[PDB]
Structure 1
Amino acid sequence: PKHYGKTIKVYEYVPLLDDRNINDQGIDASGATIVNGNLYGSSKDIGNITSKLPLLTENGGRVNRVGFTRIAREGSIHKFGFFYEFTQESIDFDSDDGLM
């Protein structure tokens, strides 16, 4: 629409378990604070998965915490044009009609 500039933007929402999801809400199974919120990134290591699995005792308080992230995109528009010009004699006295 008009009166909105020359740009369009949109959000993209990242899943929970990707590497792009970076935040500080993490709490590991022991209850201590941890750097990364997501349980594990796009990592297929069995050792890392075993280390970072969410495990629960009978009483689970403040054990495993997660977070989320979103991304934005954009695009813009431009203007183009060209022209040409002539005279009346060039049209009247030319050999063939239909030049226009």
Structure 2
Amino acid sequence: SKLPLLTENGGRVNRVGFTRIAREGSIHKFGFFYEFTQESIDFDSDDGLM
């Protein structure tokens, strides 16, 4: 019932349209840290602690 049929006289028949879509995404921020003292390094048994 929706086939674009055409007669020998043509005319303004079977017009169509188009569409488009948009996608999006965003970034975020992360981080963490730790703290220490000089003694916690110098007097510790393991010299490879850091």
TM over 0.5: yes
Identity of aligned residues (%): 100
Q: Structure 2 stretches of 5 or more lacking a match?
A: none
Alignment partner of 1:79 is 2:13: no
Q: Structure 1 stretches of 5 or more lacking a match?
A: 1-50
Q: Which range moved further: 74-83 or 57-66? A: 57-66
Report the structure number with the largest CA radius of gyration.
Answer: 2
Structure 1 or 2: more strand by fraction: 1
Let me know the Cα RMSD of the aligned residues: 0.7
Q: 2:37 and 2:13 mapped to 1: Cα distance?
A: 85
Q: 1:93 and 1:53 mapped to 2: Cα distance?
A: 87
TM-score (norm 1): 0.48
The size of the alignment, in residue pairs, is: 50
Runs of 4+ in 1 over 2 A off after TM superposition: none
1:58 to partner: Cα distance: 0.8
Q: 1:96 and 1:55 mapped to 2: Cα distance?
A: 86
Q: 2:8 and 2:28 mapped to 1: Cα distance?
A: 62
Q: 1:57 and 1:98 mapped to 2: Cα distance?
A: 88
1:93 to partner: Cα distance: 0.9
1:54 to partner: Cα distance: 1.1
TM-score (norm 2): 0.91
1:63 to partner: Cα distance: 1.3
